Write a protein that binds this ligand. Structure first.
Ligand SMILES: Nc1ncnc2c1ncn2[C@@H]1O[C@H](COP(=O)(O)OP(=O)(O)OP(=O)(O)O)[C@@H](O)[C@H]1O
Lengths: 205, 117, 218, 205, 107, 117
RNA sequence: AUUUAUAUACUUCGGCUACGUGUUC
RNA sequence: ACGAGAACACGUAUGCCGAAGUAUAUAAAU
């Protein structure tokens, strides 16, 4: 029995707006008054994209069942052949190095870029202001992967690489189709934090 | 404290609002207070930053200048006593009281908005 | 549709509110004297004591059965001076008030009822499940109806908005009151609803009645 | 399943005043502090124009529900229906060649044209300072085309190229009727980023 | 308690969540209550040595258990990103009897 | 720092402003400072550019020339001490202090604008 | 060479924790 | 030699969906 830890940083290519508070603020840790990326959001988008990559049928659309590999990697425990999740996502916190950079260069942590709404036949505008983390900021995340079985490890990491690759060409947060919330992954590290399984041959881009 | 509500009711004269004051005359005003609202809500300690003191001074700059432009703005800024409360905030260096002033002005804005032609 | 007796889940599975259960216990507060003291000095005969006892027995053993016919409630212990009804949370409260009024009619407002109602989750050991005018007129009739009409007319305001209302109201601080003023400014109700709610929150008795009513709503 | 990347550059032919943040400045980043074209503006312009170019009824004008192909391409999902936007329109960034061009030509990043308000039969003037992105500026943009159904890629890219053309013959931003907001598209490249879909016979002008 | 009272920090947060219906893509909201990050809890373990020759093995096992727990979650939704904990300021003190408890470690 | 406010109040003499100074006499002045305001607000580092040093020199040129034209301009530019503060800004090569001077002059302008005939 | 200095309208609208399940051998 | 003893309120799922910071009024008179 062993566990594999995945570490890295998520850079916001453009404005990210998680904004679970609902004006229209962003989720903040109440210990440091900072915007965060909840892990469950990351894991849900990975789930959705990876499921859509593999078979996703009408009858599969009905029930939130999905391909055996996706269910195996993310766990269902809903009907009959239940599978305990092998992969645990953690939250992301606004890193310390970006603390230093935005302190030294006096850069705001959250823009308020206004938007509008031109409805038709009246053309009357309607204004709104939303908050989104500033460009270029980085967040630190950590993953933990369980090996309940020995042989499958390579395939699961292949699927993880595929999921990350798809997610890098998509959005987190909201308004993604409208420009917000693009990210890229960088500075990844894979290490066996507990156990006796090697991981030098395993890579996630 | 709702004394703002009382003054606004006392300011609906036979109708006009503050004798020619409109909410859009207040644009630069609430924009400045909200901008300061963000920069202060980011802060941690109640002991105010001293460029924050400079920013409050700049806010008082905007106040006199708006008053200089329009007579209705002058009447509004004088009777409802923005000016001593800003002075005492500058004298006190307290963040929570700064947000108290912020909701004060926002109360004025909202009540006036419902209190219009 | 099934005549066979069903389990506790038949009442738990109601979708009109939280899937819970309601329980009511009642005792005549002025009963010891009623059987003992009776009608003083002129009608304390064995005949009239017998009549009094039988009339109480008939009330607590027939009228309840007819009164309960419009409630999703099941009669458990009835008789003597003890009344035990179990069912849906809303139906238990409504039946408790209605039976209280009906009893006040039968005793012509001479005997009163002491009762307590709690909320517990389904299939809890019923053993441990078991171990007025203001509430009707002010809470159930006035504030509850106001809140129901307002929440039905304005959408998007679910348990989250009411729970923020609760967080502001339970922590009795003026900062919560100013926050609630802003929240009602932001809310999309008729101005009458907002004004009434804020002014209710400004009074301690009215804030307690308001929180009770809105807790009943969910 | 696959994704298709639409990349290119937008040059700016006349003044550009997006002014989303607003003497009345323009939308500007806060990591490097250069003006950007919010993807929301791109999407709004493209949607409104391509929608109006085909049919637009008054009942259609009522509540932002339009013909089936726009509602497919940009996504609505309110009318009890399943549809997500098939284009991911991102933000635009003032490219590096423009950086170096204006840095080594000592040309400002933004002009500041002054305006006036001549009142009728009163001839009293009302001044006005306004700011705009200079001519010749170029931004880089990316669109991501998810492929949901195999059989509609060709027609959707035909509609996309018509949208690009019609935008090229129209303005973008604010005050477009007074002569600022003209753009033009060039250097379009099409690549398949994830999957096994072919991107050879596919062109955009 | 002192730190949060000084800094005026609420004891417990409330995160908002959703869920996506497939073929429908309409989100039904969700409300969850979460203990604030960075709080500290106080814990005590009592070990009753009944066999002398087993204490080292037992404490090695309990260290392994702590090690796994540090790399896992407590409570609910652990795969969703909550429940990660950490152990600090651990001391080992014998309080009844005469067994030396200075060579035992728990990190 | 509001000592500008104090001097402007001390400069309302029995009424005239700086003995014949008008805000439109200041046109070229605030135009130059605002132009520099833009070119500096574009910059990134606090270490000033050296053509920016040249531009500050040119600003001092405008100061000495405006003073030469009008006596009221001379009195204004001398008492409220534009001139040492420009000298120390030239000596310091600091951007943030340059914007501090900018807000200073803008404070003068706004307060005078409200303090007029 | 002599007067303005951004002006009035709108400052988020619509639509509001489901299931395995409570207890014992 | 305590109505005691074994026993993770636990497992699957997000703040999403659509919305253009707009629409008007020449840096002028001697
Ligand atoms: N129908 C009836 N006829 C005659 N006696 C009755 C009848 N119902 C109840 N009683 C008697 O009256 C007595 C009332 O005592 P009990 O403590 O149960 O109520 P109580 O004294 O009224 O309690 P409390 O005052 O706290 O409400 C009981 O001992 C019971 O035997």
């Amino acid at each position: 029995y062993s566990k594999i830890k995945i570490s890295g940083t998520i850079e916001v290519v453009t404005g990210l707006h998680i904004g679970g508070g609902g004006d229209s603020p962003v989720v903040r840790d109440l210990q440091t008054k900072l915007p965060i990326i909840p892990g469950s959001s990351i894991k849900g988008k990975m789930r959705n994209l990876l499921a859509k990559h593999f078979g996703l049928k009408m009858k599969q659309e009905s029930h939130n069942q999905d391909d055996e590999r996706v269910l195996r990697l993310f766990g269902s425990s809903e009907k009959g052949n239940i599978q305990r999740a092998r992969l645990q996502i953690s939250d992301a916190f606004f890193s310390e190095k970006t603390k230093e950079h935005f302190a030294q260069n006096d850069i705001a942590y959250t823009e308020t870029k206004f938007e509008n709404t031109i409805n038709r036949l009246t053309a009357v505008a309607n204004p709104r202001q939303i908050e989104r983390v500033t460009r270029g900021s980085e967040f630190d995340f950590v993953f933990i992967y369980n090996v309940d079985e020995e042989s499958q490890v390579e395939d699961d990491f292949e699927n993880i690489e595929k999921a990350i690759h798809l997610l890098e060409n998509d959005y987190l947060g909201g308004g993604g189709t409208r420009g917000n919330g693009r990210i890229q992954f960088k500075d990844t590290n894979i290490e066996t934090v507990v156990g006796e399984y090697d991981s030098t041959n395993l890579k996630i881009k | 404290m709702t004394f703002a509500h009382e003054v606004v009711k006392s300011n609906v004269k036979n109708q006009v609002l503050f004798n020619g004051l409109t909410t859009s005359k207040l644009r630069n005003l609430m924009e400045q207070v909200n901008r300061l609202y963000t920069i202060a809500f980011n802060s941690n300690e109640d002991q105010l930053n001293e460029e924050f003191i400079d920013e409050l001074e700049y806010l008082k700059i905007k106040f006199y200048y708006e008053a200089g432009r329009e007579k209705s703005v002058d009447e509004f800024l004088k009777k409802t006593l923005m000016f001593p409360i800003i002075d005492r905030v500058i004298k006190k260096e307290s963040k929570k009281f700064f947000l108290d002033y912020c909701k004060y002005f926002e109360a004025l804005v909202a009540y006036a908005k419902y209190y219009q032609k | 549709q099934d005549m066979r007796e069903k389990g506790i889940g038949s009442y738990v599975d109601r979708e009109e509110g939280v899937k819970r259960l309601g329980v009511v216990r009642a005792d005549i507060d002025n009963l010891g004297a009623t059987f003992i003291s009776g009608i003083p000095e002129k009608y304390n005969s064995i005949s009239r004591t017998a009549t009094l006892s039988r009339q109480l027995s008939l009330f607590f053993k027939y009228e309840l059965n007819h009164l309960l016919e419009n409630y999703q409630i099941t009669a458990i212990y009835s008789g003597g001076d003890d009344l035990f009804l179990i069912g849906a949370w809303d139906d238990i409260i409504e039946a408790s008030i209605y039976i209280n009024d009906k009893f006040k009619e039968f005793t012509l407002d001479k005997l009163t009822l002491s009762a307590g109602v709690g909320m517990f989750s389904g299939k809890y050991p019923v053993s441990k499940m078991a171990f007025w005018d203001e509430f009707k007129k002010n809470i159930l009739e006035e504030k509850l109806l106001v809140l129901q009409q307002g929440f039905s007319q304005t959408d998007e305001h679910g348990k989250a908005f009411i729970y923020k209302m609760l967080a502001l109201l339970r922590n009795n601080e003026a900062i919560n009151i100013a926050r609630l003023a802003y929240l009602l400014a932001r809310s999309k109700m008729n101005e009458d609803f907002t004004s009434k709610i804020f002014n209710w929150a400004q009074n301690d008795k009215d804030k307690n009645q308001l929180i009770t009513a809105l807790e009943y709503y969910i």
